[PDB]
Design a protein around this motif. Structure first.
Motif, PDB file in Angstrom:
ATOM      1  N   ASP A   1      -6.081 108.920  63.140  1.00  0.00           N
ATOM      2  CA  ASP A   1      -4.829 108.516  63.741  1.00  0.00           C
ATOM      3  C   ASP A   1      -3.783 109.615  63.774  1.00  0.00           C
ATOM      4  O   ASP A   1      -2.787 109.466  64.488  1.00  0.00           O
ATOM      5  CB  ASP A   1      -4.283 107.314  62.984  1.00  0.00           C
TER       6      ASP A   1
ATOM      7  N   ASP B   1       5.274 113.649  68.821  1.00  0.00           N
ATOM      8  CA  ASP B   1       6.646 113.166  68.832  1.00  0.00           C
ATOM      9  C   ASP B   1       7.614 114.333  68.997  1.00  0.00           C
ATOM     10  O   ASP B   1       7.353 115.435  68.510  1.00  0.00           O
ATOM     11  CB  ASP B   1       6.964 112.402  67.552  1.00  0.00           C
TER      12      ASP B   1
ATOM     13  N   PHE C   1      11.472  99.539  58.245  1.00  0.00           N
ATOM     14  CA  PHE C   1      10.266 100.328  58.434  1.00  0.00           C
ATOM     15  C   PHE C   1       9.456 100.368  57.149  1.00  0.00           C
ATOM     16  O   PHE C   1       9.986 100.173  56.053  1.00  0.00           O
ATOM     17  CB  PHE C   1      10.621 101.752  58.847  1.00  0.00           C
TER      18      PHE C   1
ATOM     19  N   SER D   1       5.257  94.821  58.068  1.00  0.00           N
ATOM     20  CA  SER D   1       4.893  93.423  58.168  1.00  0.00           C
ATOM     21  C   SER D   1       4.946  92.812  56.782  1.00  0.00           C
ATOM     22  O   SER D   1       4.085  93.130  55.951  1.00  0.00           O
ATOM     23  CB  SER D   1       3.498  93.280  58.754  1.00  0.00           C
TER      24      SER D   1
ATOM     25  N   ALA E   1      -0.136 104.919  60.665  1.00  0.00           N
ATOM     26  CA  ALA E   1      -0.285 104.080  61.843  1.00  0.00           C
ATOM     27  C   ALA E   1       0.857 104.339  62.812  1.00  0.00           C
ATOM     28  O   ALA E   1       2.028 104.355  62.426  1.00  0.00           O
ATOM     29  CB  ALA E   1      -0.320 102.603  61.457  1.00  0.00           C
ATOM     30  N   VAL E   2       0.500 104.541  64.074  1.00  0.00           N
ATOM     31  CA  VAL E   2       1.436 104.864  65.151  1.00  0.00           C
ATOM     32  C   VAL E   2       2.446 103.736  65.390  1.00  0.00           C
ATOM     33  O   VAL E   2       3.626 104.049  65.618  1.00  0.00           O
ATOM     34  CB  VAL E   2       0.654 105.266  66.421  1.00  0.00           C
ATOM     35  N   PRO E   3       2.095 102.435  65.333  1.00  0.00           N
ATOM     36  CA  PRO E   3       3.178 101.435  65.250  1.00  0.00           C
ATOM     37  C   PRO E   3       4.019 101.560  63.990  1.00  0.00           C
ATOM     38  O   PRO E   3       5.239 101.748  64.081  1.00  0.00           O
ATOM     39  CB  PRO E   3       2.423 100.099  65.311  1.00  0.00           C
ATOM     40  N   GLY E   4       3.398 101.480  62.818  1.00  0.00           N
ATOM     41  CA  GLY E   4       4.066 101.777  61.567  1.00  0.00           C
ATOM     42  C   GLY E   4       5.158 100.824  61.137  1.00  0.00           C
ATOM     43  O   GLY E   4       5.898 101.147  60.208  1.00  0.00           O
ATOM     44  N   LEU E   5       5.291  99.667  61.773  1.00  0.00           N
ATOM     45  CA  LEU E   5       6.328  98.733  61.369  1.00  0.00           C
ATOM     46  C   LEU E   5       5.952  98.058  60.059  1.00  0.00           C
ATOM     47  O   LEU E   5       4.815  98.142  59.590  1.00  0.00           O
ATOM     48  CB  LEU E   5       6.563  97.678  62.445  1.00  0.00           C
TER      49      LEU E   5
END
Lengths: 319, 290, 50, 98
Positions: free
Chosen positions: A139, A99, D77, D35, D29-33
């Motif tokens: 990851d 990033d 987030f 839920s 986790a690369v999405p990381g949203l």
């Protein structure tokens, strides 16, 4: 022009090089003034700070000495990407995240860096005991397999040297590592720190050969690319870098044709057989005393490079 | 020790222009107390531009951050390999720095007008090592590909070498470049001689490699690897000549070894400066000489 | 705007900016205060960091 | 006690309500949203409360209990800073919803 005499009086005296002592049991003030090196950590009183002399410019002097002040790089990692039962003296490796604005870095100790290699295919028992899930480490690198597959993994990881202090936070762990200088702890009893590397990952290169002995025998890291998953070995040697590349080529001479026989180099980037980097120097006489490292269950053999002087370099490719 | 250097000489807009860059570095002439204007960075070499002389000059003299600018002096401290410093990324080609990334100093390939102060003072570029070697490669292949399409239009295309050369990439940072689209032939451009060294060494590498393998293989076995890696080259470069005038062959070998070593010392970026902890909110970084 | 063959239970969450009341009894813990200690951690040439 | 589940598309083991949500909750986790139904579905979180009550409440207040969500940002987030955020949540304790 008489004030210049007082200025040259305040500027003259070097550290004491010779001292004609007479007896040992007397303990003269002059030999104490030779052997007294100033401290770095003291209690908080202005008279106590003045005797400790921490306000002196650059180096410590009570109102240059061949000694260097250490720098302390700071890092931030997620709490699951690191185990708080790591030793104090262990080298670390930064992986650069992809990033652009990051803040939170990604650091791998060789125990943790082992399970980035084994999953996908003793020492591995402990590496699976401490970092239980590889998925919590698989990851932090986003694309590990593609990056091994084109053999540009070594220029993404720069070594940062040994660890000093781990304030065991809850979620975002903050670690301090010495990128350069005399590796010494920041503790109120300022205890010595010995850099440890696990024994099975660390092969000596001196006694591997089985009159000129210098004082500073360096410690080399080496990432190597194997078709059975890449490996991180460490190397102790008392030679120059010119010698270290040739003797490492002769040491890796079975593995190069092993990889050549199993995997033909179809593209042009697989031919890089890993690289090396000087992690720094230490004492060639008192080097690499063995020790033991206990987690709650087991015990791996581990070396202890004592009183290490960290100095990172770049990567020079083995071929 | 004593580290300050007071150099003697400005006006208000000069004060503001020099004040814009109070965290940057530039080389000096000598490690003395007082100096003149001419002994400052990159002035007497960059005004025909040529890269290899400037890299030699940058590895020649020492380096110095500057601290304060008065009306008639510039207070600046030279850097010594003992202790550490604090410098800034205050260069108009903005390459974002990162933690524990080694910083380089290359002579300015990004045009005179970006990294300068018009009084002269020419500051060198500071930027990290993978960006350094990648911008070296992507300016060199840009040079040879521009010379080829100036020679032969059917060998390559101009947009063919701008889809892959006008941009550098490092950890998602997809920057652009100021590439000189009109270099002009017969030299006269920056990096005109480094490509002219690279082509000669890549031309003499077959005559070197075949002569070396044929001379090493007669000493029967110190190692198997010199014949083990005989299969990995193509057989086109294998059966080339095996015969030349050994006066001419020896002269070609000596020139290729000298140019190879100078080029390999230049591909190593020069004075490697190592960071410890970069802070983008402050635009400062701990740094020391290596 | 006809119903499909399935129904849905939405799930959300909510943020209650409360203002809590920590109440403790007298002489619960026995804290131990240490002496403050200063230490030098980075020594550059422009400004040392304590 | 008259019906096992009231819906059979989520209460089962390999059901729809489990297999699209109950992956192992990772902070990296690369999405990381965030839920919000992951507190009701994470089986490892469903068996962290296997301990009795006293050591449940002490491990509930001694840390951030399980799966908190960030404030002060635009879209919610999952918690990644952890230094300046602090909140207790009973839905990571009693496992219900209002």
């Amino acid at each position: 022009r008489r004030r210049l005499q007082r200025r040259i009086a305040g500027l003259l005296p070097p550290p004491a090089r010779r001292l004609n002592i007479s007896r040992g049991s007397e303990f003269t003030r002059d030999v104490r003034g030779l052997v007294e090196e100033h401290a770095q950590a003291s209690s908080l009183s202005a008279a106590a700070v003045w005797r400790a002399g921490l306000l002196a410019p650059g180096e410590v002097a009570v109102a240059w000495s061949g000694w260097r002040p250490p720098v302390f790089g700071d890092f931030l990692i997620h709490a699951s990407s690191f185990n708080n039962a790591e030793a104090t003296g262990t080298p670390l490796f930064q992986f650069k995240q992809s990033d652009p604005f990051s803040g939170v870095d990604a650091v791998f100790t060789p125990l943790s860096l082992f399970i980035l290699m084994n999953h996908g295919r003793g020492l591995t028992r402990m590496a699976n005991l401490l970092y239980d899930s590889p998925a919590t480490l698989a990851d932090l690198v986003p694309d590990f397999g593609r990056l091994v597959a084109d053999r540009r993994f070594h220029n993404f990881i720069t070594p940062v040297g040994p660890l000093v202090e781990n304030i065991k936070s809850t979620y975002l762990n903050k670690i301090t590592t010495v990128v350069h200088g005399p590796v010494v702890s920041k503790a109120i009893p300022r205890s010595t720190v010995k850099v440890t590397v696990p024994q099975e990952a660390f092969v000596d290169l001196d006694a591997w050969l089985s009159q000129p002995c210098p004082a500073d025998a360096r410690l080399y890291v080496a990432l190597t690319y194997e078709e059975a998953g890449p490996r991180f070995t460490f190397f102790q040697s008392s030679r120059g870098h010119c010698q270290i590349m040739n003797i490492l080529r002769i040491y890796y001479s079975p593995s190069i044709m092993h990889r050549y026989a199993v995997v033909q180099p179809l593209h042009i980037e697989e031919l890089t057989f890993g690289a090396v980097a000087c992690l720094g120097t230490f004492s060639a006489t008192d080097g690499w005393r063995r020790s033991a490292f206990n987690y709650r269950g087991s015990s791996l053999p581990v070396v202890e490079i004592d009183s290490f002087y960290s100095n990172v370099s770049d990567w020079e490719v083995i071929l | 020790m004593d580290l300050k250097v007071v150099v003697s000489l400005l006006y208000t807009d000069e004060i503001a222009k020099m004040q814009q860059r109070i965290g940057c570095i530039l080389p000096l002439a000598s490690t003395h107390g007082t100096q003149n204007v001419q002994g400052l960075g990159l002035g007497q070499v960059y005004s025909v531009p040529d890269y290899v002389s400037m890299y030699n000059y940058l590895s020649d003299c020492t380096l110095a951050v500057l601290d304060e600018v008065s009306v008639d002096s510039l207070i600046l401290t030279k850097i010594v390999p003992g202790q550490t410093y604090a410098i800034k990324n205050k260069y108009q080609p903005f390459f974002q720095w990162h933690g524990t990334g080694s910083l380089s100093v290359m002579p300015p390939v990004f045009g005179r007008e970006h990294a300068t102060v018009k009084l002269d003072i020419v500051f060198p570029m500071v930027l990290p090592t993978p960006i350094a070697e990648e911008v070296l490669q992507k300016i060199l292949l840009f040079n040879v590909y521009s010379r080829v399409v100036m020679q032969a239009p059917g060998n390559a295309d101009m947009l063919d070498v701008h889809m892959h050369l006008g941009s550098v990439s490092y950890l998602g940072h997809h920057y652009e470049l100021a590439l000189p689209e009109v270099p002009g032939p017969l030299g006269l451009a920056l990096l005109d001689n480094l490509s002219l060294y690279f082509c000669i060494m890549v031309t003499l590498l077959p005559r070197a490699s075949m002569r070396l393998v044929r001379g090493l293989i007669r000493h029967e076995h110190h190692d198997l690897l010199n014949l083990f890696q005989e299969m990995v080259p193509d057989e086109i470069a294998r059966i080339d000549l095996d015969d030349l005038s050994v006066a001419d062959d020896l002269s070609r070998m000596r020139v290729m070894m000298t140019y190879l070593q100078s080029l390999a010392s230049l591909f190593n970026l020069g004075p490697r400066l190592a960071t410890a902890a970069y802070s983008q909110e402050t635009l400062t970084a701990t740094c020391w000489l290596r | 705007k006809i119903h499909p063959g399935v129904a849905m239970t939405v799930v959300r969450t909510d943020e209650i900016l409360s203002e809590n009341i920590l109440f403790s009894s007298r002489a619960s813990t026995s804290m131990f205060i240490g002496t403050p200690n200063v230490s030098r951690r980075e020594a550059r040439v422009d400004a040392v960091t304590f | 006690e008259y019906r096992s589940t009231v819906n059979p598309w989520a209460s089962q083991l390999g059901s729809l309500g489990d297999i699209m949500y109950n992956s192992s909750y990772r902070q990296t986790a690369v999405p990381g949203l965030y839920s919000p139904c992951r507190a009701f579905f994470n089986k490892e979180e469903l068996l962290r409360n296997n301990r009795g009550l006293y050591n449940m409440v002490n491990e509930y207040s001694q840390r951030l209990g399980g799966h908190p969500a960030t404030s002060n940002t635009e879209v919610q987030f999952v918690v990644i800073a952890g230094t300046d955020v602090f909140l207790e949540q009973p839905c990571s304790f009693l496992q219900e919803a209002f």
